[PDB]
Design a protein around this nucleic acid. Structure first.
Length: 50
RNA sequence: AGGAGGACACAAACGGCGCGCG
């Protein structure tokens, strides 16, 4: 349950690849790649180009 | 003779590593 909630606060994060720890719910909530700064504050918009 | 009867709808995703540009 600890690994499911806030993976990384444990002694060591679990992984299923070359030592790439699995992202948890708390990992998805916060962070520069998290929802707050990735999809809510700044979001990709249609009707645009470059 | 007479007479009688007789299927609609429906268009490609997510995480690393590297490089590069503003």
């Amino acid at each position: 349950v600890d690994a499911l909630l806030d993976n990384g606060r444990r002694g060591r994060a679990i992984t299923g690849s070359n030592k790439r720890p699995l992202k948890s719910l708390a990992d998805m909530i916060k962070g520069k790649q998290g929802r707050f700064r990735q999809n809510l504050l700044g979001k990709r918009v249609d009707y645009s180009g470059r």
